[PDB]
Symmetry: D2
Subunit: 156 residues, 4 copies
Amino acid sequence: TTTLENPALLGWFRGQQTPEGWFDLLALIVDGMVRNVGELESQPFLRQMGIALADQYPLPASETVGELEANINAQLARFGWGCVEIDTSDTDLTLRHQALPVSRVEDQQSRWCHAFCAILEGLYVRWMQGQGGKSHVTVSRERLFSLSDVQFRYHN
Amino acid sequence: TTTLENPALLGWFRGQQTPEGWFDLLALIVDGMVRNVGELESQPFLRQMGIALADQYPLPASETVGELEANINAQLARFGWGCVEIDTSDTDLTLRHQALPVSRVEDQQSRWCHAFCAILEGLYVRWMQGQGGKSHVTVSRERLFSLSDVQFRYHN
Amino acid sequence: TTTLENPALLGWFRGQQTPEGWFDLLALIVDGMVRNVGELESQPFLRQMGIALADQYPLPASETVGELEANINAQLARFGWGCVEIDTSDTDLTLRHQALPVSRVEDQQSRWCHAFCAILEGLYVRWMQGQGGKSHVTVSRERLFSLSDVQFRYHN
Amino acid sequence: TTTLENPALLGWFRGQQTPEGWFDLLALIVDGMVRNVGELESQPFLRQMGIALADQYPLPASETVGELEANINAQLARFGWGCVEIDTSDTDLTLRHQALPVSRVEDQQSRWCHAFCAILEGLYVRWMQGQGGKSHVTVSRERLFSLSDVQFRYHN
């Protein structure tokens, strides 16, 4: 019942989500690389980076979608990146990610968001491969609700 | 626009608000003392402790209510206790405190809330005397909306 | 090769050991209570509080002294209170606690140290009882090296 | 006084110095970029990145070398990157940086260190420009103590 209509509370929450120092340097590195190389051709390489991240922190075996959601939520809370929820459709899966991190500089924010989204793709794929998913099965974007909310579609 | 209808997000937020270890020991000490002495009989003494805390961290002088609100919000965010907002009436002031810390054990939580409210009173008094307030002018609790929302009244 | 001969490094380490806000309030409460009641008279009651804390965070079963040391070290690292090492004699055990937390105010600090030691006693006892230790065993101090180094002696 | 001869204490200290998640991703990005491009021709670009970082957080005016050391130490402690000390020679300045961050992967760690060093260079330059120094003056390495200690020479 405790909302964030007061700007001070949301400001404190967003500031505590991303601690000082490291995040600014990471944003600067990513923005410099994407400006120097380009938008589209940088999509694959970044994805590979995400895959490597999933090699660092494997998850235990899961038998139901609820348990997988619990493990993913626990790991994301450990990272302090936000939260995600799972939904099942007639044939495909949907992941709703909320409370997306926001850079302090407003002008570059948009670009930054796109870059960050790409990374998540790679990571998510390997986690879904934890149950034995095939290597050629991937995920792609479908829509962007706002600057701090995204949804992903998983299909075989 | 990022609400907390998902229990995972609010759980992570509340867990990050109060880090492990120190908060549990503080809650145990306060609960033991209040059980040994009593809710009313310990109300004055606790107040004094709050005043002592305000001696540690003075605030700079302010000329407007908005500036005082800004300073109080900055200090509270530094403590990571939540947020408060000021409202002015024809004769009295009102403080609205949101996102009150909640103990992990739900059984004692009610009692805990009351205890916490008491100490806040004392602290607020000293800060209000930062602008030249008299010693004999105090504040008193008037109503409790829920387990995580309080309001104080400043009057002569 | 990472020494603390430079005061700034040790200052930052000690400041990050005890996060802002909660620790000052806890120190104020403990100091007020011990001044009101007395150093010896408050020694037993505090111990009981420690016991309650050990009920919150149980440890898994241990078979060797090294494994138990690993569990205790992991829990203390989770608390961020410092480190402890175990030594075994012909009949009794010794626990050396290093990097004890230090209050910001130098004048009261000595008193604070004593109080803190008392709490640890209770906690340690229940953890030692985790393998089936009986109630009649006790833990007592023997000597204090300095303001940030303690040693406890356990005998049957 | 309180040494770190016990590996557990230094392990906890290093683990707290770099929180989980962000640091691993930053290390992965830097390592991938340097592998893709090369160590030497990647030296200039990284430097410029550091300059950009110094654009974010200007320092207040300082009149003495000790005051500048105090400001730099305060900012570094705010970042939680370690500590640095200033020494003056017959014609040039020397900066001794201690407790350098260390990556969790031991194999790549050495490479990481070199990369990190480059960034610091650029940053330091702009901070030395805070006292009206011209842009043409730079800093360079002279020798490396170990994996967690470095020294820089500032000459005109």
